[PDB]
Amino acid sequence: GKMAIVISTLNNPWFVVLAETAKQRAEQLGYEATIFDSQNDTAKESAHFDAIIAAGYDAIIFNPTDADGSIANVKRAKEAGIPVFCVDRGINARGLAVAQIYSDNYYGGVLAGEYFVKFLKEKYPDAKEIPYAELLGILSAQPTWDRSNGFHSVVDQYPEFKMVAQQSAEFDRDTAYKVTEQILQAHPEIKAIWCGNDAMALGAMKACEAAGRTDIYIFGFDGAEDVINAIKEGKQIVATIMQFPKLMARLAVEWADQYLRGERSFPEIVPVTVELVTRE
């Protein structure tokens, strides 16, 4: 059998790992697999779907370019009797894809908020107020808000923690440096910074270092090598959340295999868990 891997782009290592891992796993499970690159263009994606259908692929492993724009493509595959398993990104429709597998950003935010409170209440057990800042990801991106909302679902229950600044740094390291530099001038009372990803945590740390604010504790998300090393080295970044993209890609392929072997009972919306990383 053959599986088509339709990836949103290959211009970012995150997506390359997803596509290549899926192809590898399909081959391990005895299938042929081919990667199709949509190049962040829903029209290119649509053309790939039509080619894939015409060529009679047995399953599609899909990373959509747009949660709305990609719906019609999955519907055409469904009408052609080709099962679709989404990975990393989803579509805003049910009953079309067999399953939509994604990293549990909301739960990661919950884990991060829990540790934020644990760590900071250990450092500051008596403080009436623990002011902090939040760096958001890209405002239009679902992961931005799943992470932030998860964090706040925990931290907002502890009124002593006071968010005195909240701003996007675009999931970007250099932007986070600039934004953090400004936040430190405007809100020097902060004791901590919660960051929607590791790139932004690294930028925040460099801004803190430049300001001599080595006392401020920083919390991130992704499990990037540089942040894991910073945490392990006892730097002021003290936590992150590890994601498992290879497990996500492999799960989509494994479920596709299971489906072709006759299984039909799959949940449609499928979070793949994440894990807290700390000094200790």
Numbering used by the authors: 2 to 281
The authors write:
Bacterial periplasmic binding proteins (PBP) are receptors for extracellular solutes in metabolite uptake, chemotaxis, and intercellular communication processes.
The apo-form of tmRBP was solved by separately searching with the amino- and carboxy-terminal domains of the ribose-bound form of tmRBP. The two molecules found in the tmRBP asymmetric unit differ in the inter-domain closure angle by 10°, analogous to the conformational heterogeneity observed in ecRBP. Molecule B is related to molecule A by a 10° closing about the hinge. This movement is limited to one of the two strands (residues 101–106) which connect the two domains. The positions of four bound water molecules are conserved (separated by less than 1.5Å in the aligned structures) in the open forms of ecRBP and tmRBP.
